[PDB]
Amino acid sequence: VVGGEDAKPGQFPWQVVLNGKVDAFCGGSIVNEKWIVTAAHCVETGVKITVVAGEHNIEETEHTEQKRNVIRIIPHHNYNAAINKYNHDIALLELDEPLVLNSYVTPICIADKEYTNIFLKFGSGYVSGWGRVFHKGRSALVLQYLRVPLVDRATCLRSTKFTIYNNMFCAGFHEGGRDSCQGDSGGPHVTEVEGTSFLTGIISWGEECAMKGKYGIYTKVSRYVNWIKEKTKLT
């Protein structure tokens, strides 16, 4: 996250970090004790992925952390990296052992399609992650967050030569300086409804981070909430 602020411990208790060949290569959100939702492009790899919940400083111990192995990855069935790296950018990770729910390890709420879209259209979401604090920069140690406004779809399409699909939305600032960035992908874009946060997007991609005239591109979760609930069901 470029131009955000340090989260306070447990401020985003649904946030998880994904660790592999490299630490904090992507984020994710807790759906329930056994499942994480992330971006499919994060998990288009043969390397083993570790999930860390209750995380605050990826280089310190707060005594609130929980590490798990990923035993199965379900990319959305429409995702196809050969055709497009970011269209239908959503996947689910099954954990080996359940997370233990507490003040620091709490699921994100997920409404149905209609309400996820109503929540998105309120127009102001929070993105969080341990991604780069500047374009081409170092990762954050302390989890970062940033409030981002929703961007009009035609305005977003005019901002780039790259195709913005209807499975994506844009959010962020024109002026540059504030945006999600490499390492944040997979993490949450949430909307707070009377103190209860709901998942409204997945941090997906962009061109250069926090560049003037450019926006953050996010997976439009409303189109996938049914699939999330159907694939992550426990009982």
């Binding site: 649904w14 729910l101 709490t106 699921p107 946060s197």
Partner: protein, 54 residues
């Protein structure tokens, strides 16, 4: 009065009933409060809630 206006005053979800009535509901881990509009935790760690002192 109607889900089409101010979410029928439901904190989370609203469904229209017959004759300009509405039924409010909440996401998993929450229950409809006394007022039949608000949502309150029904579990120890309800989703999307910050419980650590800020």
């Amino acid at each position: 009065m109607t889900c089409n206006i101010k979410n029928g005053r439901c904190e989370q979800f609203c469904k229209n009933s017959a004759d300009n009535k509405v039924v409010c509901s909440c996401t998993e881990g929450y229950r409809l409060a006394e007022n039949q509009k608000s949502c309150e935790p029904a579990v120890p760690f309800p989703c999307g809630r910050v419980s650590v002192s800020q």
